[PDB]
Write an enzyme that holds these catalytic residues in place. Structure first.
Site, PDB file in Angstrom:
ATOM      1  N   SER A  32      -1.447 -71.317  -4.906  1.00 49.04           N
ATOM      2  CA  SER A  32      -1.025 -72.334  -6.003  1.00 49.04           C
ATOM      3  C   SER A  32      -2.054 -72.200  -7.298  1.00 49.04           C
ATOM      4  CB  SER A  32      -1.303 -73.883  -5.495  1.00 49.04           C
ATOM      5  OG  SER A  32      -0.796 -74.694  -6.241  1.00 49.04           O
ATOM      6  N   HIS A  59      11.410 -60.372  -3.934  1.00 46.32           N
ATOM      7  CA  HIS A  59      10.739 -59.101  -3.848  1.00 46.32           C
ATOM      8  C   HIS A  59       9.505 -59.009  -3.197  1.00 46.32           C
ATOM      9  CE1 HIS A  59      13.317 -59.733  -7.507  1.00 46.32           C
ATOM     10  NE2 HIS A  59      13.336 -58.437  -7.791  1.00 46.32           N
ATOM     11  N   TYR A  83       2.143 -70.573   9.696  1.00 45.91           N
ATOM     12  CA  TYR A  83       3.378 -71.435   9.810  1.00 45.91           C
ATOM     13  C   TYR A  83       4.760 -70.620   9.843  1.00 45.91           C
ATOM     14  CZ  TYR A  83       3.391 -71.895   4.940  1.00 45.91           C
ATOM     15  OH  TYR A  83       3.306 -71.513   3.577  1.00 45.91           O
ATOM     16  N   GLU A  84       4.630 -69.324   9.127  1.00 47.98           N
ATOM     17  CA  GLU A  84       5.737 -68.387   9.123  1.00 47.98           C
ATOM     18  C   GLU A  84       5.901 -67.706  10.474  1.00 47.98           C
ATOM     19  OE1 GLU A  84       7.654 -69.650   5.532  1.00 47.98           O
ATOM     20  OE2 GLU A  84       8.265 -68.094   7.274  1.00 47.98           O
ATOM     21  N   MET A 214      -2.121 -76.000   5.050  1.00 50.19           N
ATOM     22  CA  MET A 214      -1.714 -75.295   5.997  1.00 50.19           C
ATOM     23  C   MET A 214      -2.102 -73.783   5.812  1.00 50.19           C
ATOM     24  SD  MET A 214       2.130 -76.766   5.547  1.00 50.19           S
ATOM     25  CE  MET A 214       2.324 -78.511   5.573  1.00 50.19           C
ATOM     26  N   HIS A 252       8.819 -81.133  -2.575  1.00 51.41           N
ATOM     27  CA  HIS A 252       8.600 -79.661  -2.736  1.00 51.41           C
ATOM     28  C   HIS A 252       8.575 -79.164  -4.010  1.00 51.41           C
ATOM     29  CE1 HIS A 252       7.601 -75.498  -1.562  1.00 51.41           C
ATOM     30  NE2 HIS A 252       8.908 -75.182  -1.842  1.00 51.41           N
TER      31      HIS A 252
HETATM   32  C1  LIG Z   1       1.814 -78.180  -0.579  1.00 48.69           C
HETATM   33  C2  LIG Z   1       1.812 -76.454  -0.303  1.00 48.69           C
HETATM   34  N1  LIG Z   1       2.779 -76.393   0.589  1.00 48.69           N
HETATM   35  C3  LIG Z   1       4.279 -76.614   0.158  1.00 48.69           C
HETATM   36  C4  LIG Z   1       2.765 -76.971   2.006  1.00 48.69           C
HETATM   37  C5  LIG Z   1       2.794 -74.797   0.892  1.00 48.69           C
HETATM   38  C6  LIG Z   1       1.656 -74.237   1.799  1.00 48.69           C
HETATM   39  C7  LIG Z   1       1.069 -73.006   1.446  1.00 48.69           C
HETATM   40  S1  LIG Z   1      -0.649 -72.999   1.034  1.00 48.69           S
HETATM   41  O1  LIG Z   1      -0.866 -73.544   2.346  1.00 48.69           O
HETATM   42  O2  LIG Z   1      -1.083 -71.434   0.954  1.00 48.69           O
HETATM   43  O3  LIG Z   1      -0.870 -73.691  -0.115  1.00 48.69           O
END
Ligand SMILES: CC[N+](C)(C)CCCS(=O)(=O)[O-]
Ligand SMILES: CC[N+](C)(C)CCCS(=O)(=O)[O-]
Ligand SMILES: CC[N+](C)(C)CCCS(=O)(=O)[O-]
Lengths: 280, 271, 274
Positions: A32, A59, A83-84, A214, A252
């Site tokens: 993120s 992709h 989780y995948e 996660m 989401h």
């Molecule tokens: C809030 C982020 N969510 C939707 C759970 C995605 C998890 C991917 S992660 O753990 O790499 O941020």
């Protein structure tokens, strides 16, 4: 998945070294807020995972080699989440490949829920420690024969989140006028993929956790096991709801929106951290 | 283990069941251990042994699905469940719930037997679940681990209002008006994978985590139900009182729970 | 690699019974501190794991039969740790073989990190209770079909750490002048193999845990399931750091090995004969 042993990691690394002459010193895993970090990389070679034999497939994801803030980097665009249903070997192999390629520092971001009540949506929480709930419960990424070429059987996680990198990250935020968004905290891994219940969030807050997510901890463990320094940051993409009566819930599209909103700042921060690292 | 709980496989199982009965259930009921009496009031019943359903998980008497009406409403009752401590897979546990979704179930009512942690509880009390702590889930044994089945729901389900607050409110009201409100509590259920009962130190830890009862089931089914949009009501019968320190050393209740479930169903909103 | 069912466990026990005539009453699993216990056994009959068909392999481990303070023992030298990737059946089989061979009491040691702040390096913490984090999280050693030959589906863990054996162990320590090293506490299992982080240690301490380690509980669960009395002790080989900004384990084990060995021998001496 192929076993993340020295033989298989060597084969993959050697294959990559034919495709590029760049010896990365910093590895970056894009979570993120880091979605356009690869754009900032200059003199880059982009290697799709599909072009790397025995490398995990998600992709297509890419390995990007190049220069960022005057340093040689490898950027992982495309992650393998537990989780995948991915295996321990799948998650470990890319980190161990980074080690063989020359990576000394791993920088990683992720999205997390804010447990700590002082956190605001869109805040950055530098990981200073973690609680590996899967690891305590016999799903540690290192379960299995130890690969001695990489590390020891019982790795210490003392200074797992390098204190000097944390200090630098905070200094860079303060110097660039967004110190007020930056915290340091304890990250707890929820295997997922369910968001945490109010009862679960309350438990976790009381265990001393500041954010819950996660991912990430498995990579951190592999990195530390093989001697790579780690800097990790959670973007607070949701504020944990601790009360069952509340109608507020994690959504989401809003979680993704928060990441995208903060992307320019997060990437700038990472770039400015890298430019301050001692080199040569 | 077993077949993947994807839309193709679940559809196949649901379609098979729809050839064995013409009853389209609105409510699904899962009976816990010692709680098979929840099916006894089912009117105009049709019994389908699990052995008659290809790709439906099998017990190791035989398990049955019972279709019929309770207080006028179409139900399917699961008699025989698949417990994670028995070694069943995520897909095995998920499939029956996703089958219920395709059969038309809008509300799932689940019962189980649990250990009382909260010190105000007494043997034989009912604890309506208002929330849960999914210890296996937090530890990378969540039932949804694996590719998301998009036909059923989203990758990262929220568990807000997992135990529908309107159903909880209704259940409390029904108990109170039928004179057993004194037996009814609400609380947080924590899942112990099991099959060991919890040690005194474990029970103390769980109580201090904010848990009222501990059991070895139910949460996986709840997660799958919520993932695919089914409203959930769940209740634990307190069958043991947890001992918290090492220094320290049912039939009617099933019938009462049967009555309670029937009286809840009678008052459920109907569109 | 083979199910720990009655059929397989019996085949193993029978194979051992033709290699030795010693019927063990006490089984001992050597963890930290008990590396030299096998040398002190009299009338030794050393059976390597490679020489027992269907018996799990770790290397080369040995089952040593003989007498210790006048009592017949079987000593497991070479354990099966879950962090090594062994299966539940692998860990369960040796304990169930012990049951069939005649074992009534299982004595086990391990190395653990001290969470309780009063503990010192080299202290002994008799387990009086445990928190089985893997078991609560769906990795309990008993997950799967219950082997009815050995025990019940839902075993209770009341008095898992036999209180009379604990009383005897403390008494033996007091009368031999090292009661000051002996504590009784709650052991929590970290699946491992990472050492616990400061935040993890702080969480575990606040859950009521005194020591943390990566073993033992699975063996204890199998033993209790089949009705073997258990005595377990942790050697404190590391003091947990609780706040960030923070060989020694192997040294502590080697240093305290003699004393722990002496303690176990003296406990076996004072055990009830009837
Ligand atoms: C809030 C982020 N969510 C939707 C759970 C995605 C998890 C991917 S992660 O753990 O790499 O941020
Ligand atoms: C005696 C059975 N215990 C341990 C309570 C398990 C309950 C099974 S359940 O969850 O279907 O009621
Ligand atoms: C300190 C030793 N640890 C990490 C716990 C490994 C297991 C040793 S054992 O078998 O004595 O528990």
């Amino acid at each position: 998945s192929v076993t993340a042993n020295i033989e298989n990691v060597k084969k993959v690394a050697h294959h990559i070294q034919k495709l590029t002459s760049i010896v990365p010193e910093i590895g970056i895993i894009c979570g993120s807020g880091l979605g356009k970090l690869a754009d900032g990389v200059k003199d880059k070679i982009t290697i799709p995972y599909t072009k790397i034999p025995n490398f995990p497939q998600t992709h297509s994801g890419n390995l990007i080699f190049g220069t960022l803030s005057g340093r040689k980097v490898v950027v992982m665009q495309g992650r393998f989440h537990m989780y995948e249903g991915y295996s321990n070997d799948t998650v470990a192999l890319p980190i161990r490949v980074m080690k063989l390629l020359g990576v000394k520092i791993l920088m990683v971001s992720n999205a997390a829920g804010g447990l700590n009540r002082s956190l605001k949506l869109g805040d950055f929480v530098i990981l200073k420690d973690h609680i590996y709930l899967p690891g305590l419960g016999l799903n540690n990424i290192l379960v299995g024969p130890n690969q001695e070429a990489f590390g020891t059987r019982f790795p210490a996680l003392s200074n797992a989140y390098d204190r000097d990198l944390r200090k630098l990250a905070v200094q860079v935020a303060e110097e660039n006028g967004f110190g007020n968004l930056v915290h340091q905290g304890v990250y707890v891994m929820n295997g997922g993929p369910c968001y945490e219940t109010p009862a679960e969030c309350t438990m976790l807050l009381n265990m001393g956790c500041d954010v819950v997510g996660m991912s990430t901890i498995p990579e951190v463990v592999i990195a530390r096991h093989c001697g790579i320094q780690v800097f990790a940051v959670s973007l607070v993409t949701n504020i944990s709801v601790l009360d069952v009566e509340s109608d507020l819930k994690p959504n989401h599209e809003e979680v993704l929106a928060t990441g995208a909103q903060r992307a320019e700042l997060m990437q700038s921060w990472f770039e400015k951290i890298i430019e301050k690292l001692p080199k040569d």
